[PDB]
Amino acid sequence: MRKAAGKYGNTLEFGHLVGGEEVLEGPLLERRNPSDREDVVARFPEADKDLVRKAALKAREAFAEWSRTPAPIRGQVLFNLVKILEREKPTLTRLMVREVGKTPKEAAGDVQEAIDTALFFASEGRRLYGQTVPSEMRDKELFTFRRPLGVVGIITAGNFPIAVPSWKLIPAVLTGNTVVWKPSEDAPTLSFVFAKLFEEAGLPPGVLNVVFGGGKGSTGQWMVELMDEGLFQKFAFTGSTQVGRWIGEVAGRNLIRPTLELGGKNPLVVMRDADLDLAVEGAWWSAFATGGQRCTSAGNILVDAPIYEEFKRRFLERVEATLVGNPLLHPEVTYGPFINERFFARWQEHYRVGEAEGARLLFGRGRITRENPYPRFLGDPEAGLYGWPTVWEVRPGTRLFTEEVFGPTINLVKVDGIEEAIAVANSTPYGLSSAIYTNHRHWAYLFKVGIRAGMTSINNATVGAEAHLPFGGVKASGNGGRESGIWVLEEYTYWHAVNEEYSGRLQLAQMDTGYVSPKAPTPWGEVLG
Amino acid sequence: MRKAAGKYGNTLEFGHLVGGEEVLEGPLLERRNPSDREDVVARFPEADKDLVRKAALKAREAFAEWSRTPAPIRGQVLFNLVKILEREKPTLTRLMVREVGKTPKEAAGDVQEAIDTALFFASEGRRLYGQTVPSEMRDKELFTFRRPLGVVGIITAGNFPIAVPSWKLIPAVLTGNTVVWKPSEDAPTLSFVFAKLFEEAGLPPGVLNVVFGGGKGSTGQWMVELMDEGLFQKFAFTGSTQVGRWIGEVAGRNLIRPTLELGGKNPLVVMRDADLDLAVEGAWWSAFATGGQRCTSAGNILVDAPIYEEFKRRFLERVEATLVGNPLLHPEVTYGPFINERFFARWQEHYRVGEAEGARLLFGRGRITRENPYPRFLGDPEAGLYGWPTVWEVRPGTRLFTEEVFGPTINLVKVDGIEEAIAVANSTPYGLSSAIYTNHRHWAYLFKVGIRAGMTSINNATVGAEAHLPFGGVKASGNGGRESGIWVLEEYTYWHAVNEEYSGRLQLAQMDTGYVSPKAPTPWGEVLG
Amino acid sequence: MRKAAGKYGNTLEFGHLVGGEEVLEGPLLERRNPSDREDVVARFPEADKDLVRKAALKAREAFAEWSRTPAPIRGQVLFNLVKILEREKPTLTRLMVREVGKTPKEAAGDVQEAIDTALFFASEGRRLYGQTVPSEMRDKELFTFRRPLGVVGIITAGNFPIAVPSWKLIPAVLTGNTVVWKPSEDAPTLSFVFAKLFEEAGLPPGVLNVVFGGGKGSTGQWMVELMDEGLFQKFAFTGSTQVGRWIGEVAGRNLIRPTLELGGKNPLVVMRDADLDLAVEGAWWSAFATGGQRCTSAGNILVDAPIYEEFKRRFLERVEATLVGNPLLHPEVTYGPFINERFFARWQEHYRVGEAEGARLLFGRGRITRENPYPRFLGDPEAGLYGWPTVWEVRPGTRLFTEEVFGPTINLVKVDGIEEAIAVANSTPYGLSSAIYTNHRHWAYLFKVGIRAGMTSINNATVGAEAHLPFGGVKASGNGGRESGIWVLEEYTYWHAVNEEYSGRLQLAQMDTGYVSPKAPTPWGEVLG
Ligand SMILES: CCCCCCCCO[C@@H]1O[C@H](CO)[C@@H](O)[C@H](O)[C@H]1O
């Protein structure tokens, strides 16, 4: 790599990581600081299909030795990574604030998720339990083993540039797979550095390959297409449902079960008996954490009729207090810029769609500019794409209600009773996260069994999942796979059933099984009388 | 249903089972006894897309009440089925001999697999374990629950008309799902009866719907296409890889992980130190059980060079002793007719492909006729499609070596040493079953870790998997899913992670976590010696 | 603590660790370097019953806050310990060579076991899985949780002064318990330092209390007796079966299940087909690792008749090559001194018992002195208690065959065939470790299912268990408990079953359960053929 002086740090120039070598091949892209476009964070090439193919073949070559490396040793590599991530947490935090516009508080939590993941799977090296199973035949033993799949293709987004990649990278290599990783073009430096920390931790060259570039019409797409050439035995993707469906399609015909985290429209229910201040804080954080650029961000606040006016009043008050700005210059802000222009553009459009379909705009004036200033802004709004906190009143069945919109926007929806709250909460193509604020035992229970969601919070935000629960969605949010904890092992391994015969005879199961039949029954009705 | 007298039993006329009602709608198909075309087993309608859609909506309606039925009660229904299958085993055995041409011995084992499955999952009703998980926050609890998916679409083959459907039907309903089942047109009576046994066991109407018909251009295809209309939350299919890839494709874009069992080309290795008589018997049974119409049937016998001539001699001797015939009239036969004409046709062609590519035909003269008689045939060969036991000598890389061929055919392949045996055993697009005969600890181990297969037998056949191990293949044989035992629960449920807050505060994971930092270290090198 | 200059390092003076405070109360004991009596390693007090009682009450006080500390945070403390043990491994290694007379190679492996344990349970903080279980009633949920027991009393030996204590200390505190630890008077410095490393890692004061002293008539005994006062909710002990039975007795009447590792007489079988050089090396290492002062040390080498003379010849040759000496001055030695005089005394007596009962002494002349020199000795044999490598030929049923003897001694026993090998291998009151050397699949299997032992090695030593398998013995070697891995969690937690009702009615299990009865059966025998 090379470095040059920049505004808020060095501008990094680096290439793809392929077979341990740095490959500077392809038209140069750059990543500008989203808080300040004058600050250039990285310059990096776009990998073409031929280079991704080459990376996949380097991964296949490295897979042989790596899969044969004892899992406890592979786990000790991850343990090295835990120490290295701990050491580098402040540096990675600072780089993440700069590269994707996260607050230092959130950026540290993002790095911490990777540390948590690393520690969890470091120890998993001495687990990866299969089963010993009793044969129905004598002189025979049955076994199950978890085996690695091969080469994993990974495409990740930039909103969680260390945490979410770690959910895939760490289990993948722990279970004995090799990886080709196409990180978001919004967080290439973090991705490059993270790959180098793996190298420092002792991960053999070629086990992790990083190929930079865009998505559609670019490296991301090339990578999906190479599933047709048999170069990936597994695929993982975070992004939109639209793209996920196509990846599911390609994976499906290549007999791959992809890991798909495909976003959501996450209902947060506030029942009449709720702790209003707690529910307001939870709804606020659910909506505006990461500037609403999380898959788990609250989409709709479903508020029970009797507290609707009081909640709206308190919620808008809380929303109005939100600090927005350059988090590098003003750490205390709740959120900073949009991660990229694509998200900003879609978010600008949702104002027009909302007005067109009769949503009531309670708060928000679109992009924050010097001409259109936001009272609690800190820094220069012209330096990047920053969005007004935005609050709507919407009806079910509308586009603002059903469609995911990354960015600082949230809808209030009036409901009456737990039955309607559940029905309305499920009136969305998605089913990722969910939440209900209530002190009512029974309502909490009804919501928990009534919601169709991968994750449910009782008196907690739709965001901030703990790193050691299964993470994933139902309906349009996923395809059944789960990340994190013990539940992700199904994603990166396959079951190998072994039966060992010692009888020296061909014994047929279900046919030669030595089942004992019952004896003649005693007439106990008559004996006991 | 209606019945009329037939040659070897009553001819059954029945319709689709939809919402509890019998629906006799659609152009009539018939199933003739494959051992004797004069014996008509069943007449049944072909369901059009509209009726399958209606069946899927009946399943969705029944799902609400059935998923809310406590799992231990759903398990007690399966326990009722265990008793009913036990009672009906002789009747089902006889019907299976008649309808699909299995031997009574194999037909009983087929019914027994369903009984084993039924008993396993009857008890699973009081298991279905999720987890309690410790929160990193105080006054907070984490939980995981297994939830049913919804409506399961099931398409099954006729080669295992009770066993293999039970692998899907039983776990599906146990886990709280409803089912639309499109059984093979080769085993419609068995399927109808099996569905009625579920009804007798107390399965509520609409939880299992059966729609009869063909595959391509027919009910099977309509059923796959309805995944695009959101009518299936899960899909299971047994059949060819070609069809499986298409089903995987459709499932994939609808964010479904299908259960796909897609056949194999199963290597059986005989090492130089093997028990020859045992390996011969295992190779023979692996090749000719069910007339080689199993997904797990041996495709290639890989024989170690030093025992090659001796094994070939003993194997051909064993093959020559094989009895073939109408298993209804001659129970003692090893195998009877082809299940259908599709399998017979492909099997006839493999002679021409083998000769064309220079395979050496050691034994077999194609279809058994009066003109082309087989010495050990019993009954009338003109009454159905019966195949000569067929043995080839082939080279790796040839079509006979790589391509699956249902029917009584097997290849011998010369290998030298465990390294070559493993490499050649993996030189196939498939990876379902596998086997090695050896007394050498180390060779068994190398094969076990070297093979790419879902299942491996040490000194046992490639066939005859025990019903309580995970069943499934890698590569072209499957997509990662497993059937049977605890491993199939992932197929018919999704994980629901619930976090419950009691702290009355918004606590952020990874950010507010109360991690304890270390104290000042003592310089022990200096303090001690 | 205080330090003074000594021969091979500083002499440490320290007191008991009770509630965070160092308590220098009680008659002073000392630990002399077992390799060199002139080198005084430590001076430390003997805790009386009143101080142990006080330590137990400090543990009870600390238990409240520590058990309420989230398990993931408790795990992060262990993760701190992993880093600290890594840092201190060279220092701990050196101290262990000095204090208990282990070779540097073995001492490092001992420290590494603790690091392995620490890492395993660091990650267990985010596991400790209980279950969610489906109720047979509607509107009801079932849960299981692992809860800590309370205060754990731990008594450990000095032969594995870091490894074996870590097996108890680490899981105990991870699962939320507090500990009173009575370490061996043979390794008080290591124990003091290990406790201080826990303190450095952030373990709250009082969660680990260390009380030094002897066993019988001393601190060890006082500690067992306090189970009668309800001060321990759990107890763990490593030592002799005799003492273990008494501890089991006291624990039993106080409704405690103690963790008891009680030594063994570990059979190593060498079958006629074995790799002789490998079996010789394994038998040699099994016998003389730690100078035969392991619970898992080989007691009897059972050699198959046809290879008996050849094995004896090669084994005695290998034994004769054994280097013995001061491992601080000569790291390359296989073993050094006896850990204590108790073990030396019993080992001296076994010569007299062996001769008395007609055992044939093949090799060994008792204590190594200048008068009685050993050819391959390095250093001064007068400086400590060093034992000749000792090899016997014995018959089954004799005291040398059945009774555990710590120290460098081993018996050869002639057997003929796997049946006799198994019977003779089981002809001992113990059942800890076991091993068989064979290339015969079937013999390995028969031994594996025929042996009565907690642990069995196939073509591996009776020693050197991997730290992530369950460790423990049957018969006189233990009481059912297992240490290490997931299996030790049962030792330090109890199951809490919770049922939550939401139905608003009293529903009786087994009585009000809504079991569905079967429908009227169809006579299928008659309906079909
Ligand atoms: C990693 C995916 C989650 C694993 C689910 C819990 C696994 C627990 O394994 C359990 O073992 C029990 C012991 O008899 C069996 O009875 C249960 O069927 C089985 O679920």
Author numbering:
A (entry chain B), B (entry chain A), C (entry chain A): 1 to 529
Direct quotes from the study:
Initially, when we solved the structure of the native ALDHTt, we noticed the presence of an extended C-terminal tail. However, in the native structure, Glu261 has the “In” conformation, associated with proton abstraction from the thiol prior to substrate binding. As previously observed in the human ALDH2 and Ct-FDH structures, Glu261 is suitably oriented and within a short distance to Cys295 to act as a general base for its activation. In addition, the catalytic Cys295 side chain of the native structure is observed in two different conformations, the “attacking” conformation and the “resting” conformation where the side chain is rotated away from the Glu261. In the native crystal structure two partially occupied and mutually exclusive n-octyl-β-glucoside (BOG) molecules originating from the detergent used for caa3-oxidase purification; are found deep within the centre of the tetramer. They lie in a highly positive pore created by the oligomerisation domain and inter-domain linkers of each monomer. There is hydrogen bonding between the head group of the BOG and the positively charged sidechain of Arg127 on the junction between the oligomerisation domain and cofactor binding domain which is positioned directly beside Arg126 which we believe to play a crucial role in tail orientation and thus active site access. Another intriguing observation with ALDHTt is the presence of BOG molecules at the dimer-dimer interface. These BOG molecules have been modelled at partial occupancy which suggests that the detergent molecules sample several conformations in the tetramer’s pore. The negative head group of the detergent molecule is attracted to this charged pore and then becomes trapped in the central cavity. It is tempting to postulate that this highly charged pore is not coincidental and that this is a possible allosteric regulation site for ALDHTt which allows access to the substrate tunnel of each monomer.
